Ligand binder design. Structure first.
Ligand SMILES: Nc1ncnc2c1ncn2[C@@H]1O[C@H](COP(=O)(O)OP(=O)(O)O)[C@@H](O)[C@H]1O
Ligand SMILES: [Mg+2]
Length: 404
């Protein structure tokens, strides 16, 4: 008795289905629910009918996920590949905050940084068809053109200025330009910023002190540092884009708990560690048993809400809790970073769930270890699993799948 996303109030479960469909994920920061449609974007209709006019009938996942949480005074990180639609995703929320605002002030209200001149000019244009109807200007600071034409922003608007970190710094220390009013900064593709040595020049641009946002495809340690030092209360949107090693054991029905004890006491793996189980009663029973082993375990269950469920996942990240027990429902959507080990105490009847639970261990790369317990009571999956292990022939040998 359910309606498949043709509902008015929705349910937390339904929201989770929503995200899983569009593949988007978020790290908790008291986050607002994502957009289904433009008609209540939180944006004014004069901007919406422009969104329609350009032919953007459908929101890209990054747009629907990033915009609603940007409309509130919170910084966001946009982990997404190029072509995601992320440009308009940071443009629209900027435009609505452009006016919350005068002509004569002289010194940009907002700044947009990009690794390449091509991007700076793409952002310029993509912004211009949104800005020109709104009656204000966007200026690109780029070389390779006549300087007189650049110095041409005569009415001295430049409510938004888009430029390379490496050329804007050129006009900054000489103080040929001022950021007295730049209280909104956007960092598109900080990947190739660092990949093209804009690190220190970018850091030079730290003036004024409100929102700052950051769209990338990746977060290497250089990029993560740049993030933490300048992003107050980060909100991390992510979009779904082999890694896993897939060790597998054959065992009796419940000798498996002693093996789990052995693994945990091996110390080979570093908490957080996720151990899945097919049955709820066995979920809470093994969790209590791991509690008796002295380990710090946290249970994520539907009786409580996201406010507390999120608190629990955060309680997993922050090291107050080490091991997590779960049913398939308990954490289909969860995205706890760099978990050392996925223990399938019971392999699920459906095969896609296995792929799903092991599918979340490496962000861009991790230990990716997944031990899966097996028996003859779970024979139906055996023939399938083998070939899927071959599909990820990388990182693992099935070694002993001589039967089905
Ligand atoms: N809401 C939308 N719906 C459909 N197409 C869009 C939307 N927003 C942007 N586009 C188009 O998608 C193309 C991809 O560009 P874009 O995704 O903005 O690059 P990036 O991912 O690097 O920001 C652009 O040419 C743009 O015209
Ligand atoms: Mg885009």
């Amino acid at each position: 008795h359910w309606s498949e996303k043709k509902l008015e109030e929705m349910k937390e479960r339904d929201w989770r289905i929503f995200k899983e469909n569009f593949g988007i994920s978020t790290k908790g920061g008291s986050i607002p629910n994502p957009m289904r449609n433009w008609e209540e974007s939180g944006l004014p209709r004069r901007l919406l009918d422009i969104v329609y006019r350009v032919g953007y009938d459908e929101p890209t996942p990054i747009q629907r996920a990033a915009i609603p949480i940007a409309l509130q005074a919170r910084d966001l990180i946009g982990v997404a590949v190029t072509g995601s639609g992320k440009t308009a995703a940071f443009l629209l929320p900027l435009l609505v905050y452009i006016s919350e605002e005068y002509n004569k002030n002289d010194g940009p209200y907002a700044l947009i940084l990009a690794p390449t001149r091509e991007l700076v000019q793409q952002i310029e244009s993509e912004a211009r068809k949104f800005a020109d109807p709104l009656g204000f200007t966007v200026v690109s600071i780029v070389g390779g053109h006549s300087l007189e034409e650049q110095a041409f922003a005569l009415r001295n608007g430049a409510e938004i200025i888009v430029a390379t970190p490496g050329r804007l710094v050129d006009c900054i220390e000489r103080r040929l330009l001022v950021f007295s009013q730049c209280c909104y900064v956007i960092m598109d593709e900080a990947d190739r910023m660092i990949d093209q040595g804009f690190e220190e020049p970018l850091t030079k641009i730290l003036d004024a002190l409100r929102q700052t946002m950051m769209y990338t495809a990746t977060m290497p340690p250089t990029v993560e540092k740049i993030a933490k030092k300048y992003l107050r209360r980060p909100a991390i949107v992510t979009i779904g884009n082999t890694v896993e090693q897939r060790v597998e054991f054959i065992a009796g029905e419940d000798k498996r708990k002693r093996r789990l004890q052995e693994i945990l006491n091996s110390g080979q793996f570093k908490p957080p560690i996720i151990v899945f189980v097919n049955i709820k009663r066995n979920c809470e029973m093994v969790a209590k048993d791991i509690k008796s082993w002295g380990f710090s375990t946290v249970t994520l269950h539907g009786s409580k809400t996201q406010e507390q469920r999120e608190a629990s996942l955060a309680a997993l990240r922050n090291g107050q809790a080490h091991i997590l027990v779960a049913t398939d429902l308990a954490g289909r959507g969860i995205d706890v970073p760099d978990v050392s080990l996925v223990v399938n105490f019971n392999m699920p009847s459906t095969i896609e769930a296995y792929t799903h639970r092991i599918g979340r261990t490496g962000r861009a790369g991790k230990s990716g270890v997944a031990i899966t317990f097996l028996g003859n009571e779970d024979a139906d999956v055996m023939y399938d699993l083998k070939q899927i292990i071959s599909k990820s022939s990388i990182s693992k040998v099935p070694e002993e799948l001589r039967r089905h």
